[PDB]
Design a protein around this ligand. Structure first.
Ligand SMILES: Nc1ncnc2c1ncn2[C@@H]1O[C@H](COP(=O)(O)OP(=O)(O)OP(=O)(O)O)[C@@H](O)[C@H]1O
Ligand SMILES: Nc1ncnc2c1ncn2[C@@H]1O[C@H](COP(=O)(O)OP(=O)(O)OP(=O)(O)O)[C@@H](O)[C@H]1O
Lengths: 550, 550
């Protein structure tokens, strides 16, 4: 019941010439709750920069104004009561529209309500916006042909009607629908402000006259400076104080947008007849359930993420290629015996393979979710902890079956140390190393939010780890022995060599000894550092995601 | 001067319920040259599927109709005379709008004209659409804040006015501009059909009445079936034959879209009053400069691609990380001598590094250009040969300076074979191997147009090449010796070992001999296969790009 009163005074936004050009220059206005606003202007004006300014999405040293919610600046608490509908529609392309609106319903409604109230509120906004025939079809990308471009927008307004916010900042909501859905959409957005008493800000672009009668305070913009702030029928008459009237009966909207360019420099005489005639008048007018919440927000964000990857049939081919690589690694060391250089080669090639394959595929988790994650993080839907521990729990379904299907062939074809306990110890060490190296691909990929930029960082880093993982050079300079402890391949190599060759007495009985496990690190201080790396790379991937608010 | 007469008869398009739903059902119409059409309807109708059908962009077993240009089906020759302006605007985000319109001007105009005619035609469409104040600013992505959303559309119509096509199929051109740029844009598209005599098809959505007076044949659609085909003022009067008229004076457009839904099942009585009253009336109405062209199309597509990567300052950091990895590889083998296992380790780690780093970064060239390349390839702007030999010549500027900056440190810090001829032979073999392995990342990445799907194919393939590149296993089964010839790491390893250790007599004098160059392959039949691979992987990357027409 937060009564948002939005007041902006003298906001200016200048970008560098890439001098500087003024996008906005001196915009003032007051939006008390109940007032249905409208931001009009030509297609270069500064409307969407003003709407990205008052919705908090624009911050920086460029803005030289004061945006005030309830006579205070924009906090983080008011940024979860403000609903923002952007121009471009960024949605999850593999869901349908019913799963999208159901997940936004279940994740954002007050949680004191039962589940069927949370579903009837989701299918009470589908019938209100008219998305009933496209209810059970996909909302896909440019390539994945899904729903229309006018239903990819009526979904992205019901995406923010299931928040019930107190300040509704819509950025061109109806540019994309016909003239009989525009009227019903503005009837909805006016029944949310002459009904439930909210604060609605619209940037409508090409209205009719009976879509213009619904507005209570129109902001007419022109090249950054505003021409009019005030009522609907006071416009089309305020411009008779300066002497501009149509010669024949037309709509008010195309006339107010004809005067917005100058259709003897009409624009500047309206700007100076604004600034001193009717601008000083607006200058005188101005715990135990906190856990259950977090676990429901994990079940939802995991059930969505497991619906995203049911479309992907490029996982049987991943399994069949890793099986082929395992058959290769088994058939080449087929003629190996237990007695050791030829086997340390295999136990280092496994450490190369499963530090290179998970870390080079984990750089596509967070960069490929960026355009939707920034939007949902700015909106304030879920917590970042519950979002991060859904990708973490979503990778751990097929990043545990590929090394198991690898090792199930390449153990019993090479005929390594027989018995079920060294096999299970080898499999557990391989799975722990895979999860430890996947954290590196998570962290480089959350820190540099670009798959192409991070794929040449993680490649050089994993090759430096493969280099200083104890196999290649014999006599390393002793001021540089310390680097193999920072490696992640070193611990897995030491553990695999330890598991296969004991602490080493039976080999010293049968038969160098230098890089075989009679050596440097123990067996528990090499699983105590793999677990530390598995936790620390994910803590760093969370801390590098905490910076992305925008 | 191709006089396109577009005629579609009984086109139906059904998608599977993911039974089947009819998107379109029985659409007929004739567009002779000079007729300015308009496709109207509600926001679920089947307009953009009809416009993707008649512009050739929809093909498949779903379409059960006949699209006819000049009483013949759509060839590839007519697909370079048809201009299609899609709903979503896919543009190159790093250019400005002036470079974008200049490159489309220089690349598509008849080439018999001089260059300044080709530039005055480019800045004669900027002033016509009004893009003069946003002429020299960027057109960037969702992240890169560039021009507006109404200037990201007035650019994507001047993108297809600099073709001068004979059939102009616009898909919602004005949904995004105000009511005084809509009138001027439809004045332009009507002066292209009452002027230069073309065939213009528009899907306008929210028109005025004086944007509706410009239309010569309106197609009113409703839920896939069409309600009206014919003149402008014959609509608003044909619906008086069935008995629907407004009670008070309004625009024709909102009335024709109010009847399009049923505002006693009005929609079906209009469909059956269409099908037998005024549908049978339309059933009765129905060399040495060829090289210079290709080289100009290479200079343009290369000067654009070198403008795309001037924004990237993440290349000094690539150079500084590869320099750090080289300093690492030098400092670890700092204590190496010329006399050989410790050096074959280094000559195989270089072969690992420069087969892993180029092939894992070359998978982002063609998947990251996909959404714009499919559009330009469907449009018919450049040839695929000249497009492919611009990415090929664009990678070869920093995929030749990273191995040189690597080797310049890691040769003289390890102190390998001294002299300028083994150094230059090593550098040339390294550059040839880098270009040979970059072709693998090109081919897997053109074949599977997804960076995430191809990054787990190229990783397993390069690890299989590293495995069967002659270093790891000692006694491979002899039915599997043949696999190292398919490898690309094997030839570079053999060449580096040959260059450093001769054919081998001085080492047999100073001092195994088995995997040192006294061995299997020669020195010329290992550069004759690296060149074959360098050509064959790029031929496969061209053949896998030839399938993407869409
Ligand atoms: N980062 C930037 N750098 C340079 N110029 C910019 C930048 N962002 C916006 N502009 C310019 O400032 C003007 C205002 O942009 P804005 O997004 O407000 O337009 P708009 O009113 O949203 O357009 P429309 O109403 O057609 O969507 C635009 O014409 C644009 O060219
Ligand atoms: N691949 C598909 N699978 C299932 N349904 C589809 C598919 N493509 C389109 N549709 C449905 O068919 C209808 C027609 O889509 P179309 O793109 O023609 O709408 P439109 O007329 O372009 O909408 P608008 O005019 O608002 O842009 C849409 O409502 C959409 O839901």
């Amino acid at each position: 019941c937060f009564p948002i009163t939005l007041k902006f005074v003298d906001v200016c936004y200048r970008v560098k010439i890439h001098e500087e050009r003024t996008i906005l220059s001196g915009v003032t206005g007051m939006i008390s709750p109940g007032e249905f606003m409208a931001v009009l202007g030509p297609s270069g004006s500064g409307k969407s920069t003003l709407l990205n300014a008052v919705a908090g999405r624009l911050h920086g040293s460029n803005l030289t104004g004061k945006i005030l919610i309830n006579d205070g600046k924009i906090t983080k608490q008011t940024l979860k009561r403000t609903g923002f509908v952007a121009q471009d529609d960024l949605l999850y392309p593999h869901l349908t529209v019913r799963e999208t609106l159901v997940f936004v319903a279940l994740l954002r409604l007050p949680r004191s309500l039962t589940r069927d109230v949370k579903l009837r509120a989701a299918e009470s906004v589908i019938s209100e916006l008219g998305l009933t025939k496209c209810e059970n079809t996909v909302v896909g990308n440019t390539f994945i042909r899904g729903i229309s471009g006018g239903e990819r927008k009526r979904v992205s307004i019901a995406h923010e009607l299931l928040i019930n916010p107190s300040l509704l900042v819509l950025d061109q909501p109806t540019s994309g629908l016909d003239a009989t859905a525009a009227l019903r959409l503005v009837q909805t957005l006016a029944g949310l402000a002459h009904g439930k008493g909210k604060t609605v800000v619209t940037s409508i672009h090409q209205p009719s006259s009976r879509v213009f009668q619904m507005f209570d305070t129109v902001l007419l913009l022109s090249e950054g400076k505003c021409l009019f702030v005030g009522k609907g029928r006071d416009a089309m008459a305020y411009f008779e104080s300066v002497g501009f009237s149509p010669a024949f009966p037309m709509n008010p909207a195309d006339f107010l947008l004809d005067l917005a360019n100058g259709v003897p420099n009409v624009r500047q005489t309206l700007v100076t007849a604004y600034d001193t005639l009717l601008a000083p008048q607006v200058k005188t007018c101005i715990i135990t359930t906190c856990i259950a919440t977090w676990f429901s927000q994990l079940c939802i964000l995991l059930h969505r993420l497991l619906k995203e990857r049911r479309h992907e049939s490029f996982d049987l081919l991943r399994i069949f290629q890793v099986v082929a690589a395992s058959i290769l690694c088994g058939l080449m060391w087929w003629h190996s015996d237990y007695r050791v250089h030829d086997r340390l080669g295999l136990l280092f090639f496994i450490s190369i393979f499963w530090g290179v394959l998970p870390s080079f595929n984990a750089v596509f988790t967070f960069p490929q979710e960026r355009a939707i994650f920034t939007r949902e993080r700015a909106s304030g839907m879920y917590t970042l902890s519950s979002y991060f521990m859904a990708h973490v729990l979503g990778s751990l379904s097929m990043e545990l079956v590929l090394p198991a299907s690898f090792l199930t062939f390449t153990y019993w074809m090479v005929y390594l140390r027989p018995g079920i306990v060294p096999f299970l110890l080898t499999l557990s060490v391989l799975l722990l190393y895979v999860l430890a190296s996947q954290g590196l691909g998570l962290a480089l990929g959350a820190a540099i939010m670009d798959a192409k930029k991070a794929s040449t960082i993680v490649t050089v880093t994993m090759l430096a780890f493969v280099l200083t993982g104890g196999y290649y050079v014999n006599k390393v300079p002793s001021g540089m022995v310390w680097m193999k402890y920072v490696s992640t391949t070193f611990y897995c190599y030491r553990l695999l060599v330890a598991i296969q060759y004991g602490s080493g007495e039976e080999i010293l009985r049968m038969l160098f000894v230098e890089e075989e496990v009679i050596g440097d690190v123990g067996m528990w201080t090499s699983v105590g550092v793999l677990f530390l790396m598995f936790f620390g790379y994910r803590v760093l991937a969370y801390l590098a995601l905490r910076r992305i608010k925008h």
